[PDB]
């Protein structure tokens, strides 16, 4: 059974799924978030939603924004490299 | 670099693993040799065996005639022996054109040693395993024996042996030469020279060997010849004619 | 031997399937029978046709599986 | 000493017309007063509506032609059987001719 | 270990040949199914062309080397081209030097030698591509199988690519019949299409995947390409 | 380092696989070939006041009938262009006419094979393969308007439309729905802008996008900043009136 | 490693307790080895015997013995 | 043969050797170029800590590539000579052959090209240097500023900064320049350049070397005396904005 | 031990490099081929494996000619054997031009020997994994030689190599003893065919097709020619008569 590398359509679904439970303020398209991943594993995806929430809590927020999700992709992938 | 025995470079200890292993297990190929000097000949006896009845033992060669006058006795395997033979033969011939003169044992020995050394430093070649004993009866020195060994080391002998009955051969000749006060025996005919050789051989290796189990190469002034099978039995029977 | 134990539609040709599998071992021919049944399980069939087995081979048996036809 | 270069005669005539063109040539091949051939095609079809004749000295004709025949073949392979244009073929010859002049 | 003998192409291993070489034989099966068949007067090549997409256009699985010769590839593309150029070069020179077309046999043996040289060279590699090379020379009709380690076999019929064993069962039965039809192109051609669709078992056949090439006693290298293969199914 | 002749159990070389990894990290290049032209569009990206954003573009002209847009490493695409210009120039001199886009891709792909230690088949002078993939678009008088995707692996396929880059998975999917066989040059360019807007996390300006076109009365023609912006101006209003 | 002499003695000794048709030429058998000590020689004996269980007999030919020593040599050193 | 590998792929689609080349530049000294719309200013560090250097034969950071073109760098001097030499030859090659003064774009392509080669080609490694190339095209009064990396990539930039604390100097510069209103007068564009480069050199007003390039071969290096004066002034400005 | 399994550019303590051992092994992993010296000639025969009816007779004969009077047959892997021979050929053409005489069988042994030995001094060239049995008639008598993959070679009276090496030496050693060396060249085809039959008994998973060739100075006149027709056909019968099954 694979748990290696999923598709663009696939990355989108796993993002959509962790952020339901969260409050959010509008302007999110999952597709856009997915786009910034050149290659991921399931571990990385879980890290994008949870990290995106943290930028909001520092500013003191309950909601998540399109900006936050982008910011979390950039951090996670780059650390994974090397 | 790499490592010290995956490519040829110095060991931790300043040794070379490849030359020492080249000394050892290239004489254990069911080969034992001796060379002794005549008065006006040079004699070599060397073992040479054929394990099939289906292997023509004529082609089986480990005394080679390098030129019409020069012989080279190889201790070690036929893949190696022909790399050294090709070099020897070429060197012999080249020498003959260029310098106008027949090739001495010593010059050939020295040239081959230096070449092996270069191949020892190379990281994409090996030193050959073979031990090469070059024989003739030079008109510039008399009967001669010069031996090279695999490390790029070489040195002249008056009588030599190889294979682990080295001690036995040496001691019998040493005691003999200390008594007679000479390192060459005196006798004209080649026949009596081969009988002297056999005497020391039989005692020392503790056995006698068949015609096809021996190969005897004789150096004479301006000829080197190998003795036919009947000719090698004639000699073994001739000492036993005495008995 | 495999096809006694379990239902089949009694049309399945071992020789033909055998040409279709390359470098299969005995245990792996037994795992194809299981996968042929997993097709069958999804399909709502209680037996296996030839097709059902062909599809079984395509899926993993985990040591060798004949399905190669990709390259553009 | 040596110069193989001479002459072998023959005559060719090319006429461009309204939709058509001819390459007419005699079939006599000589070296001096001796007859080398009394039929030997002196117009030859290289393919692609291109017919060709190298009149003069034979020895150069044969060479010029062989270099060019392999170019017709290589043009096809390397460009998926796209047929050779009269103008393009003319440029290709120019380069051949110019390639030996030593 | 695997990793111990894999790194350069100059090592043998206890198996009798290098691991990498087996991986080159494996690649052929990945690439396209091509069947080869002959009678004794003509020889027929049938090949399935694959592309990647709807809006992709096919990659050619027949490369014509001469007006009496061509070959099919199966496996790695980039090597199949480097080989087809070499064969072009070999062909032409034969014609320039010897006035000679280049026999299938003659070509196979030159190609083999080139293959040994690139499997003793350490930076070099097996090609990773097998080829079915067809011709009609003055040796008769021919099919040869080339493998990228230098294995060259002359055959009546064979297949490389997807379920080779698949096609081989078909051919071996219908063999005795079709090969004694000597002087009728169409039958041998019709047997080729009948075969190739039964090797398939996770693909289907269609007109513009299929492409047929025949060479023979009265057929100079001719491809039926796209539409015109319908009339051989 | 890493083998240059060492394949996977499938038989796909490490170096090829690694080639595929650099490609996926560039900015999208999208081509649609139509019946009146080929459109090639790129996302140039980056907007800064410390950046000259309209002095850099990713659509470079090879010839008066051939362009290429790239995606992947840009430094690598310079060696590919130097080889490609030389080959096209030498063919225009010999036969006076246009070189075929498929023909060009094969000539380039031949020199993509060198990397590593040499062969005895080939002299391998480089160290890695090229880490850029290209969409080469052109015109020829014998197949009209065409679009080609060259992979650095060796494979080159003709397409009617293809996208490459990071955002290609989405992009291609859109291309198919929008694609039909009565599509024209003017529609295709508008549509390119739609695709580009959708996938951006920004506003589409001509300092993050560049258009280009092919018409056969002018060859390969760059759709200039001034025209591309006028097209962007028209987009924003019309889209923002469907909402 | 044995002698030629050592191999002969041990072949003769092993086939003495054994039941056989025909006088055996141990001398060939020795050639067909190259340095087999007593344990290796025993495997050759039983090997011959296997074709004799099949040939439905408690005796063995010269013919069996030549084949037998060679098959054991090939399957190892 | 030493045409075999010495630069290999990453699994991430980078190259190991290019990632390591950029690190040497960062540890290094800082060079900057800021544009007016009349000049292009280049600042280069000379932070002599020790006083036992004799500084008329201590290497400079400013090279002529051509009489209207300069190259500045941050990185290993040893590698930079090798690049600097090939770039002078290329300016003279054009001059000889085209009968024409050199255009900035082609030179940049050339500088990019040797570095690009050495990543691609085997038994060589890329240089340890990033550069800034600037100058003016012939019969042209608008400034030109290019950046090249030892990856071999290249770009134009309105202003760019390299070496140690590149972040800090970009970030600052961004607040003090607009493309719509860049500076007209030499004095104020130089004031800004000296002020950015003060903030990273620490103490420096003889350790900062300014060279201001106006159109077509008016290239003039401002001196210590002049620089000390702008630093005084900056110490007056910082208590007018308090 | 180690380094000697990947290289040949350094020397084993065993006196025998592990890579060299692997080369011999692939020889025994081929087919049987043999060679018979006789009182005027040499006769060569090989077992050609039949797997399928998709293979064609006498185009996948493993007998390949060099010069005019040397026939060369092998056991091991096909590509190694053909490349080795193609090199023999080239040296043979060179020989003929230069010395205006055909290439000897002893000369050819040396030519092959030096190409193999060269690849066993270098780790940068990989050697051959075939044993090639060859021979002919020349100006200086009849010769049978066998080349082994170390770069060891000698002249033999009889030779075998391959899967069926043992069974072949047995059947040969009886026939050679009985005769002075192998009697006539005619007789030798019949004898050969018996040897192949015994050698088949180690295969038995494939059928075989018998292929013989000869080089004879009394019934071919010094040329290498195939043995086919009547002579091959009497030989199949002789084998099947005495050898039963």
Curated annotation (Swiss-Prot), chain A:
Query: In its UniProt entry, what is this protein called?
Result: 26S proteasome regulatory subunit 7 homolog
Query: What function does the entry list?
Result: The 26S proteasome is involved in the ATP-dependent degradation of ubiquitinated proteins. The regulatory (or ATPase) complex confers ATP dependency and substrate specificity to the 26S complex.
Q: Where in the cell is it found?
A: Cytoplasm; Nucleus
Into which family does the record put it?
Belongs to the AAA ATPase family.
Note on file?
Present with 105 molecules/cell in log phase SD medium.
Q: What's the gene?
A: RPT1
Quaternary state and interactors: Interacts with UBR1 and CIC1.
> What's the PTM story here?
The N-terminus is blocked.
Q: Which domain of life is it from?
A: Eukaryota
UniProtKB/Swiss-Prot annotation, chain B:
The covalent link annotated as Glycyl lysine isopeptide (Lys-Gly) (interchain with G-Cter in ubiquitin) occurs at 223
Which InterPro entries did the record assign? Ntn_hydrolases_N, Proteasome_alpha, Proteasome_alpha-type, Proteasome_asu_N, Proteasome_sua/b, Proteasome_subunit_alpha6
Cell location: Cytoplasm; Nucleus
Q: Which SMART domains match?
A: Proteasome_A_N
Phosphoserine modification, residue list: 228
> What keywords are assigned to this protein?
Acetylation, Cytoplasm, Isopeptide bond, Nucleus, Phosphoprotein, Proteasome, Ubl conjugation
Q: Name one GO cellular component term.
A: proteasome core complex, alpha-subunit complex
Question: Which biological processes are named by the entry's GO terms?
Answer: proteasomal ubiquitin-independent protein catabolic process; proteasome-mediated ubiquitin-dependent protein catabolic process
Q: Any other comment in the entry?
A: Present with 15200 molecules/cell in log phase SD medium.
Q: How does it assemble?
A: The 26S proteasome consists of a 20S proteasome core and two 19S regulatory subunits. The 20S proteasome core is composed of 28 subunits that are arranged in four stacked rings, resulting in a barrel-shaped structure. The two end rings are each formed by seven alpha subunits, and the two central rings are each formed by seven beta subunits. The catalytic chamber with the active sites is on the inside of the barrel. Interacts with CIC1.
Q: Which family does it belong to?
A: Belongs to the peptidase T1A family.
User: In its UniProt entry, what is this protein called?
Assistant: Proteasome subunit alpha type-1
> Which gene is the coding source of this polypeptide chain?
SCL1
From Swiss-Prot, chain C:
Signal peptide range equals: none
PTM entry text: N-acetylated by NAT1.
Question: Where does the source fall among the domains of life?
Answer: Eukaryota
Where is it localised?
A: Cytoplasm; Nucleus
Q: Which family does it belong to?
A: Belongs to the AAA ATPase family.
Reported function: The 26S proteasome is involved in the ATP-dependent degradation of ubiquitinated proteins. The regulatory (or ATPase) complex confers ATP dependency and substrate specificity to the 26S complex.
Q: What is this protein called?
A: 26S proteasome regulatory subunit 6A
Q: Which organism is it from?
A: Saccharomyces cerevisiae (strain ATCC 204508 / S288c)
Q: What is the lineage of its organism?
A: Eukaryota, Fungi, Dikarya, Ascomycota, Saccharomycotina
From-to range in the entire protein, with total length: 363 to 434 of 434
From Swiss-Prot, chain E:
Please identify the protein, giving its name as recorded.
Proteasome subunit alpha type-6
Q: What other remark does the UniProt record contain for this protein?
A: Present with 7210 molecules/cell in log phase SD medium.
Would the keyword Phosphoprotein be found if you checked this record's keyword annotation?
yes
**Record function comment:** The proteasome degrades poly-ubiquitinated proteins in the cytoplasm and in the nucleus. It is essential for the regulated turnover of proteins and for the removal of misfolded proteins. The proteasome is a multicatalytic proteinase complex that is characterized by its ability to cleave peptides with Arg, Phe, Tyr, Leu, and Glu adjacent to the leaving group at neutral or slightly basic pH. It has an ATP-dependent proteolytic activity.
Pfam entry (one):
Proteasome
Annotated crosslink Glycyl lysine isopeptide (Lys-Gly) (interchain with G-Cter in ubiquitin) location: 190
- Family to which this protein belongs: Belongs to the peptidase T1A family.
The encoding gene is PRE5
Q: InterPro entries given for it?
A: Ntn_hydrolases_N (IPR029055), Proteasome_alpha (IPR050115), Proteasome_alpha-type (IPR023332), Proteasome_asu_N (IPR000426), Proteasome_sua/b (IPR001353)
Origin species: Saccharomyces cerevisiae (strain ATCC 204508 / S288c)
Q: Where are the transmembrane segments?
A: none
Q: Which UniProt keywords apply?
A: Cytoplasm, Isopeptide bond, Nucleus, Phosphoprotein, Proteasome, Ubl conjugation
User: Which residues in this protein are found as Phosphoserine?
Assistant: 13
What SMART domains does the record tag this protein with?
Proteasome_A_N
